[model samples]
Target: GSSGSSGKRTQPCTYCTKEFVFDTIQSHQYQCPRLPVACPNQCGVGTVAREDLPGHLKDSCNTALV
Candidate 1:
């Protein structure tokens, strides 16, 4: 095979396995579902996946206010 190169780049969010270019991935990390985040209500559940926060608060966090 001959050596060739293209101007495209790709990156993966290891947590969710979503692929994107570097620029998009930068913003994506902030909203990535698999990204771990602390409970906003300070429920003491340690870190939970970003996407699980709502459900965790509804069904699991003891200190959830609502």
Candidate 2:
């Protein structure tokens, strides 16, 4: 790689499609809001496998317990 950021920088996250400065970008796909802490109320959780995540809705599972 010859170049990326310079005196000024900014970009959209390739993961969350969110924008960020070329400095700090965290909690992307692995922890994106569009991807976590919910039920299918159309929701999701990251505790499930990355591959099986879309299938395991923890909130629903817990609700089933009660």
Candidate 3:
């Protein structure tokens, strides 16, 4: 069940096929692709916008911040 930025609704995860809320959806998308692809957000190493993410590799995840 989703409830934000829109009306409450039901939806499935594009990758996991699981049900979740809208807020959780964005978090789920981070590792959803299940494959190596560009980060959904265009953030760099040290800075990521609230609505953006750093596209760094697994190795860089630890050192990234925003």
Candidate 4:
């Protein structure tokens, strides 16, 4: 570590468990796989993380409980 380092706080990404500068985490969060995204179906359904969305869209979306 250098004395002149950027001085930003380092923390693990909440989604990926990878380390990154804390200040940048929010931007990273937007794309982080561990996080959920809005349903593009725009059905006002609750969000599901990426892993479940494709299955949900194909299988459950039509019958999803409002």
List model 4 lDDT by residue over 1-66, tens digit each: 576766788789767889988888868887777688778887666888887787778767755543
Point to the candidate with the largest TM-score: 1
Per-residue error (Å), model 4, residue 35: 1.0
Per-residue accuracy of model 3 over 1-66 as CA lDDT, tens digit each: 255475656568755678877777777777565423544443345444323333453345554456
Using lDDT as the measure, the top candidate is: 1
Give candidate 1's total backbone clashes: 0
Q: What is the C-alpha RMSD, rounded to one decimal, of candidate 4? A: 4.9
TM-score of candidate 3 to 2 decimals? 0.34
lDDT, residue 50, candidate 1:
90
TM-scores of the models, in the order given: 0.76, 0.32, 0.34, 0.58
lDDT of 4 at 15: 73
Query: Which TM-score value belongs to model 2?
Result: 0.32
In order, the Cα lDDT scores of the candidates are 0.84, 0.48, 0.53, 0.77
Candidate 2: stretches off by over 4 Å = 1-6, 26-31, 34-66
lDDT: worst 10-residue window of model 4: 57-66
Task: Order the numbered candidates by TM-score, best leading.
Answer: 1, 4, 3, 2
